[PDB]
Amino acid sequence: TLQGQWIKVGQKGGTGPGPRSSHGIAAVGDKLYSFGGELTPNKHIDKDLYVFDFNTQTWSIAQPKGDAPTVSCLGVRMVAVGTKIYIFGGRDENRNFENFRSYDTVTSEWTFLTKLDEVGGPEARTFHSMASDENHVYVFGGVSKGGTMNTPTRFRTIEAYNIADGKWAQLPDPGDNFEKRGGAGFAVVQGKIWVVYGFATSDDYESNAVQFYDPASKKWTEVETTGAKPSARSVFAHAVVGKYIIIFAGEVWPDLNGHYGPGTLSNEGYALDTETLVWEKLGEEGAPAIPRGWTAYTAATVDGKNGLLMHGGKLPTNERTDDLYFYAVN
Amino acid sequence: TLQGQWIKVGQKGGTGPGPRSSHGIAAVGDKLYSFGGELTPNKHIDKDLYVFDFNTQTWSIAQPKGDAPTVSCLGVRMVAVGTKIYIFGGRDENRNFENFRSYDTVTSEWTFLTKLDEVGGPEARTFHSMASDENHVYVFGGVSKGGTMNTPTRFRTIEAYNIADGKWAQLPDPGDNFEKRGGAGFAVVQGKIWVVYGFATSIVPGGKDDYESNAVQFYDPASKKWTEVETTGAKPSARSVFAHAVVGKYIIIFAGEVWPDLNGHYGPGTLSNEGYALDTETLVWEKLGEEGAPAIPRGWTAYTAATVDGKNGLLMHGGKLPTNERTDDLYFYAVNSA
């Protein structure tokens, strides 16, 4: 069984993002980068790239050199490969949708990489999920713009960006028996791409569906998991550590008013062993008490340990938080 | 290891309670009895004794012979011993509090047993918990009657009613390190009395800091002493007002309130749709299997141990939903391992 604990990461000042949900973070080395956010329900905040340095445990704002983002986003996501971070999707309150961009942590420069919602290209999106490997950025699910006269729909497909080629290609469509989902767990584990739970169309509902896509065979497997298996949920913090997909919190039941209310949130964590398909429940020690969902999340290494880094989110009071927590894995 | 599944028990008509929460149920033989309820938040409904017959799967109203209840109650609870069921506590919208009464399923008659909130006698109460064994009805925790005479407070103690003696006595006070709680799990397991989680009073006066508890203790009649226990396994986060029952060595729980509402019992708070079982011998929790499980989170259900279609398990009725609506769902977790 997995062994680890929660640690509340002190924030000792500087120019920080403050409380927000629905944003994207990712870690490069000793630094955490944060982009996007929602404070007032369904209202954006800003388009600064915030940087948290773990050594000083303080916040600053990165220099917006190059093709800096033009839209203040909610529902945007972010991943890191090498020294670059990549943001995909998100929208502002006026329904300007962001595109596909990279920021280089060394040169502090932004590059516009792909315009979304073009013909034969990946659609613009909110509340998708992102994963990556050494040469790919992956995008799963989400809620389309989109469009323009097909109503906003969810996606059941994966879009693969080959970094060296600078090209997108859609991976094979899993088909009619797979839920189009937003707010899903999504991760690369030991060469396969896992989709875990989410919010599905088909009265729209939390899903407990688990699948992987296998690049070697170019095909999808629907998986039956066991153990301390969490009830269906979405918009949960999640990250890969080894063979484990670790999740925490999330929405267990949707709000009667969409994203305006808090719905029903969770304060519990779980870990899926992708080798055995067994779930186990994370320990309570150090865990944040107040249920949350819509946090930002990323795999990170802090003070020597791998684990799940979680920031912000909304609370059952519908308030946002600026809590930064780390589940450190032994 | 524990083996079971949820079954939605069909309800085929008659005069049933409809949707409600915060009521008391208990089973005698092939019948389920239901008293009390809350539909509109903090409003009572009625004072009928409802009876659900598992053979016909239909509802009727028991005739109120003898000293019938006088108060339409929310926050009342019920236990069954032998052929009698017992109701304790509860209050109506106007803060009239019910007392201690039993209904004899053989004679179909109510008997008044104890007037509550008398001097040296057990205090009146809302959202306490009840358990029982062959010669006792036990009452734990709850929220006391509110006067200006100080304020409504919670209890950390157990009150024991000896059935043969017709007498109440408070069991030893576990003391300052045990939380005063309402909505607690409470059960007699193999000769000891277990207290599980609940909603606790904070040391900080005011109420704003009152919180879900994950404390687990038992009282041992053999030593007359309390033991606080550290449980492991797939251990649920702190919660209260969950359905629960004993099967063998297992305390089985389902659903409940994981986080309180800023508007007290007026709003839905944060509810759960997951079940767990505490193995009281090993102190290991396991998560109940999902099969047939009610999807929509709930809390404030009525609950009882029951035997249905040959199997023992947890019977759960009604409760409130995240939409703040009530349900009339009747669910049974049938344990095959029995």
From Swiss-Prot, chain B:
Pfam families: Kelch_KLHDC2_KLHL20_DRC7 (PF24681). Changing residue 127 to A: Lost activity. One of its GO terms (biological process) is defense response to bacterium. Disruption phenotype: Accelerated leaf senescence and increased pathogen damages. Fe(2+) binds at residues 257, 261, 265. Changing residue 91 to K: Reduced activity. The keyword Cytoplasm applies. Changing residue 241 to C: Strongly reduced activity upon benzylglucosinolate but slightly reduced activity when allylglucosinolate is used as substrate in the presence of myrosinase. The keyword Lyase applies. The active site is at 91 (proton donor), 154 (proton donor). Homodimer. Interacts with WRKY53. The proton donor differs depending on substrates. This is N-(sulfonatooxy)alkenimidothioic acid sulfate-lyase (epithionitrile-forming). The lineage of its organism: Eukaryota, Viridiplantae, Streptophyta, Embryophyta, Tracheophyta. The gene is ESP.
